[PDB]
Write an enzyme that holds these catalytic residues in place. Structure first.
Site: not given
Ligand SMILES: CCCCCc1sc(N)nc1C(=O)O
Ligand SMILES: [Zn+2]
Ligand SMILES: [Zn+2]
Length: 231
Positions: A83, A85, A87, A148, A179
């Site tokens: 996706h 974002h 990461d 998500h 998030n």
């Molecule tokens: C279950 C997520 C834990 C922390 C929140 C974060 S930090 C990030 N790079 N992605 C996420 C996400 O929700 O995918």
């Molecule tokens: Zn994401």
């Molecule tokens: Zn993530």
């Protein structure tokens, strides 16, 4: 044992062998005042490697390529971001600079361009509708509908019965969302159910962040998404 967040300094990457020719990559980075672990996939593709997702930023992704070359020694030739974002596409320029051809669905590439993030070069066709599945070398890409995010893909390795859920699947120990700024908390349990319908044979399930598990992660994730919804 699977590496945990406190064991990976930001800037380093770990590789974890799931099966013959299938690894996860684990990195760490800051988001909103804390550091979090993040998973991607690596799949043998003949004499080449297919990468699923960056290691969350340029410095981490450069270290990802370095570790691959040292532990595995085969070239990464293609990458898919699941996706839009950071990461998942943060590091795509490093991959481009190193010779990797990068791919994402047209929605992802547009949602990333919109948002100031890096942009995979090539558009994946055949995934613009919930339920769609396309082949991409040794894996299947599958769009489950919004969760998500609206563009999130999952990845299945047939050879191994490995399901990579990305950030649509939470790890077992996680009991709170966030998030969720870009999520569809409505569609999300349904998209989880579509995944359950298509890969009931899955032996190994990788969340976007945290420890791998089984198909129980799909049920667990739904609970968490709903618990957040009713609150
Ligand atoms: C279950 C997520 C834990 C922390 C929140 C974060 S930090 C990030 N790079 N992605 C996420 C996400 O929700 O995918
Ligand atoms: Zn994401
Ligand atoms: Zn993530």
């Amino acid at each position: 044992e699977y590496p945990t967040v406190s064991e990976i300094p930001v800037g380093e990457v770990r590789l974890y062998q799931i099966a013959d020719g299938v690894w996860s990559h684990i990195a760490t980075q800051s988001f909103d005042g804390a550091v979090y672990p993040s998973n991607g996939l690596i799949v043998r593709d003949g004499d080449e490697l297919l990468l699923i997702d960056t290691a969350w930023g340029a410095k981490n992704t450069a270290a990802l390529l370095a570790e691959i070359e040292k532990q595995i020694g085969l070239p990464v030739t293609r990458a898919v971001s699941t996706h839009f974002h950071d990461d998942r596409v943060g590091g795509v320029d490093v991959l481009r600079a190193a010779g990797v051809a990068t791919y994402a669905s047209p929605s992802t590439r547009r949602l990333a361009e919109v948002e100031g993030n890096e942009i995979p070069t090539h558009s994946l066709e055949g995934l613009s509708s919930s339920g769609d599945a396309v082949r991409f070398g040794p894996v299947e890409l599958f769009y489950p509908g919004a969760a998500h995010s609206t563009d999130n893909l999952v990845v299945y390795v047939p050879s191994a019965s490995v399901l990579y859920g990305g950030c649509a699947i939470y790890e077992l120990s996680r009991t709170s969302a966030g998030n969720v700024a870009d999520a569809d908390l409505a569609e999300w349990p349904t998209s989880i159910e579509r995944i359950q319908q298509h890969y009931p044979e899955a032996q190994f399930v990788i969340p976007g962040h945290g420890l791998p598990g089984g198909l129980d992660l799909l049920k667990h994730t739904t609970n968490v998404v709903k618990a957040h919804t009713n609150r």
